Amino acid sequence: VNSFSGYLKLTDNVYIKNADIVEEAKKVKPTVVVNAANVYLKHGGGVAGALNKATNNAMQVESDDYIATNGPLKVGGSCVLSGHNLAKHCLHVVGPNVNKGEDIQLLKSAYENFNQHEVLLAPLLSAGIFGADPIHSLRVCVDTVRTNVYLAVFDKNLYDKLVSSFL
Numbered sequence: 470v471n472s473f474s475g476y477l478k479l480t481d482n483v484y485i486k487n488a489d490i491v492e493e494a495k496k497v498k499p500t501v502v503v504n505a506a507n508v509y510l511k512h513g514g515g516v517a518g519a520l521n522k523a524t525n526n527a528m529q530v531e532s533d534d535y536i537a538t539n540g541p542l543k544v545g546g547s548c549v550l551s552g553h554n555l556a557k558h559c560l561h562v563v564g565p566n567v568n569k570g571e572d573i574q575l576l577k578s579a580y581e582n583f584n585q586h587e588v589l590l591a592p593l594l595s596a597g598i599f600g601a602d603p604i605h606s607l608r609v610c611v612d613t614v615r616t617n618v619y620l621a622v623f624d625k626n627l628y629d630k631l632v633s634s635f636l
């Protein structure tokens with residue numbers, strides 16, 4: 470049993486809810502919240518900007534030190550950092566950004582990072598300002614992630630479309 474509430478079950482391991490990933494993290498304090506990161510961990514907008522704002526910029530300060538030591542992530546890669554006031558840990562995952570011309574085949578590699586964690590609260594990778602089709606992102610998630618993932622879909626309109634169209 471876990472603390473996640475109000476989710477619709479899509480498969481054995483994937484659950485979905487119309488929710489802002491930030492308010493959900495604040496309520497649950499999950500072991501792992503996933504950030505929709507870029508390779509520079511520059512948390513300007515989208516899910517990353519919202520998560521970072523909720524940490525009072527502490528996520529960005531920690532991230533700048535990580536990049537100064539390690540250099541940029543790979544598209545499709547990840548790193549584990551603090552979850553600050555939102556979660557125990559934040560898994561920063563880089564999905565391909567279609568609005569920068571990155572290979573959408575890298576979306577599967579991105580979701581494979583989730584398999585290193587038994588339970589996660591996550592957004593749909595490469596959705597929103599990363600420019601991918603969220604229906605596609607949900608299909609790759611279901612077909613790639615084997616651990617238990619609780620997806621927070623911000624847009625109510627999109628949430629209803631994802632559920633209604635799910636095979």
Ligand SMILES: Nc1ncn(CCC[C@H]2CCOC2)c2ncnc1-2
Nearest residue numbers: 532533534535536537538539540541
């Ligand atoms: N502000 C900064 N940003 C980036 N780097 C590169 C770090 C690369 C890693 C990779 C292997 O070990 C070092 C910096 N070095 C010093 N200051 C830096």
Ligand SMILES: Nc1ncn(CCC[C@H]2CCOC2)c2ncnc1-2
Nearest residue numbers: 489490515516519596597621623624
């Ligand atoms: N605070 C937040 N800001 C942005 N997004 C992503 C918005 C993109 C669309 C497409 C997939 O889901 C919504 C969030 N998702 C959950 N919480 C979020």
